[PDB]
Design a protein around this ligand. Sequence first.
Ligand code: HEM
Length: 289
Amino acid sequence: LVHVASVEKGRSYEDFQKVYNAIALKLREDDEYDNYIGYGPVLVRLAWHISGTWDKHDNTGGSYGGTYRFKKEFNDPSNAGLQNGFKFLEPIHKEFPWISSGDLFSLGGVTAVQEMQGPKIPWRCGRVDTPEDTTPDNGRLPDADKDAGYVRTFFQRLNMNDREVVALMGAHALGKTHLKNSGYEGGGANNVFTNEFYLNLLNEDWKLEKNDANNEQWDSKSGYMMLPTDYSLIQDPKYLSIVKEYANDQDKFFKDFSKAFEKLLENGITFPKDAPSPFIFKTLEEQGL
Ligand code: HEM
């Protein structure tokens, strides 16, 4: 099953930069969402969830088809709360109706990461909207209540290795969990992209507790939390080494996250050899906007 990237007809880099900028300007404007966290984190999560349905074995799922716009995927219990990212992106789509759904969703994540002072993430256009019957079934996104063996096995389906898994998980520096969405509560409420996920893992004093929803989570005396899946990155000795590396090398973490996150967003897409090179978008700040 082959999904060929097809550039939106007549569009070029500058066109996508304008979409980036509208997203970035709206991020800045709508700053009150979720107790002043802003929409950055949820947009990063949206991009991951529309990508994380991919299965390397048959090339179903992934960002390409923009299938999150369909009821079945939109309502996936694993996607609870992402409706907020979707609503954010509505007026962006109306301003730029020529962009595919998959391109918009993935670009939202790229824009959020960069505008939160994260690394540049190269991004490629050409996802094409596919019909409702291409919508993957629920259940393909990962559970939070599991251990490192689960996380490792799970991410093999997305063609991600130990370093790529640990790198990607560093996005859990961003935002927070909400009891109503996932049955967890707590987090840093942070909207600046850093390597602090790794530092928190290593430097805090963690205690495993059951929460109000009867789910297990790791809680620190300073009031941070980690999922069992997060904490598994320090229980497992291979993951631990990589955690230690990223806790001690901001630039390495930035480079590795960028590669892994672009790979995540491009899994399942065949780019023809006459496709444009990946675009690197300027931040608002770099444009003097
Ligand atoms: C084992 C893998 C993963 C699990 C089980 C997991 C689970 C979760 C859960 C349960 C939440 C809280 C949702 C809520 O209550 O609203 C969350 C938040 C988040 N996750 Fe993950 N996650 C995983 C991997 C990733 C990856 C790979 C990324 C990005 C590259 C990511 C980005 C985020 C972000 C940005 C949020 C915050 C959303 C917000 O503040 O609204 N996660 N994750």
